[PDB]
Amino acid sequence: SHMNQCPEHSQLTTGKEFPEVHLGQWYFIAGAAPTKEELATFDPVDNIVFNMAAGSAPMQLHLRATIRMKDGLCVPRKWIYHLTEGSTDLRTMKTELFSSSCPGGIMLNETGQGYQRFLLYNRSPHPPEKCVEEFKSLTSCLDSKAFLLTPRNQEACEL
Numbered sequence: 001s002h003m004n005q006c007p008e009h010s011q012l013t014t015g016k017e018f019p020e021v022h023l024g025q026w027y028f029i030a031g032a033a034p035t036k037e038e039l040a041t042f043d044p045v046d047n048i049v050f051n052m053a054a055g056s057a058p059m060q061l062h063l064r065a066t067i068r069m070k071d072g073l074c075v076p077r078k079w080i081y082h083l084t085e086g087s088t089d090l091r092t093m094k095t096e097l098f099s100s101s102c103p104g105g106i107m108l109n110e111t112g113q114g115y116q117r118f119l120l121y122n123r124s125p126h127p128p129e130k131c132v133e134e135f136k137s138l139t140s141c142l143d144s145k146a147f148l149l150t151p152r153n154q155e156a157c158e159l
């Protein structure tokens with residue numbers, strides 16, 4: 001009894017390197033979900049660039065992003081996250097962080113009311129295609145077979 005596991009995938013754990021090691025910029029590379037409808041929100045997107053910062057209060061992080069839409073428009077977004085000590089989970093729902101096969105990579109798992117999806121980010125806007133192939137392969141194995149790759153043909157919007 002064998003042949004029933006998915007590729008190796010480790011959740012990020014706490015040590016006190018988290019989260020300073022993750023701050024700075026990131027690019028949205030690809031998403032996977034049980035169905036297309038959890039990825040629908042990303043259909044008109046060319047690229048998204050993000051910046052993560054230390055919050056203002058104690059266990060807090062400022063996220064900024066600018067979405068470059070396929071039509072060329074730029075849409076700014078801002079969110080605040082709350083870490084829990086001992087945990088790498090982000091509270092805005094919960095986001096689990098996982099290590100990635102790609103150097104400079106990171107994968108998120110978003111859980112919520114009757115929806116779920118995996119989202120790949122990297123420091124580089126153009127990581128190796130292998131990295132993306134391994135993420136598709138891993139997520140398909142976890143039953144998120146619907147896949148979207150951001151095209152990243154246009155320049156990042158300012159952030």
Ligand SMILES: CCCCCCCCCCCCCC(=O)OC[C@@H](O)CO
Pocket residue numbers: 019022023026028048050052061065077097106119121
């Ligand atoms: C401090 C450790 C966290 C580092 C994670 C860096 C990845 C930053 C992106 C987080 C995106 C989550 C927001 C979200 O729901 O995505 C929807 C779109 O607007 C972008 O994917």
